[PDB]
Design a protein around this ligand. Sequence first.
Ligand code: FMN
Length: 138
Amino acid sequence: MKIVYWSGTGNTEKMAELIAKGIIESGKDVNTINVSDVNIDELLNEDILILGCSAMGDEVLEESEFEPFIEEISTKISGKKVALFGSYGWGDGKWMRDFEERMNGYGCVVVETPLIVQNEPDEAEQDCIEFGKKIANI
Ligand SMILES: Cc1cc2nc3c(=O)[nH]c(=O)nc-3n(C[C@H](O)[C@H](O)[C@H](O)COP(=O)(O)O)c2cc1C
């Protein structure tokens, strides 16, 4: 499996690592890839796309790298299962509610409720691991 993410200070990056840990504990292989190093072609071969990005701008996906990436794959992901996650700071999840509605509109099936954590995981560490285990069970 593959986990693709964008992280500005390391918060969403930490979530990605913990999610991968859950998949590994379930006995499956997984690789975490920063959005800047992802190969679209390889990524599209995956049954499940696990995508993460923190809340940026004013409740939007990061603009210089993540947003263009979503735009690029939007036309080739109809019918694909996707799991969404990300860290946020002062809001209550608006960027993720929008992200989910967007993916659903592209024809994707959002397999689980998106996982959102405020700032660094710390207390929500197990929640991240568990989300990974749910994904590994689909
Ligand atoms: C320029 C900028 C804009 C942000 N916009 C939002 C926002 O609209 N809502 C929110 O809850 N957090 C917002 N945040 C806070 C980040 O989402 C939060 O600090 C998160 O933990 C960052 O995770 P990261 O290290 O993975 O990027 C913003 C942060 C920055 C730097």
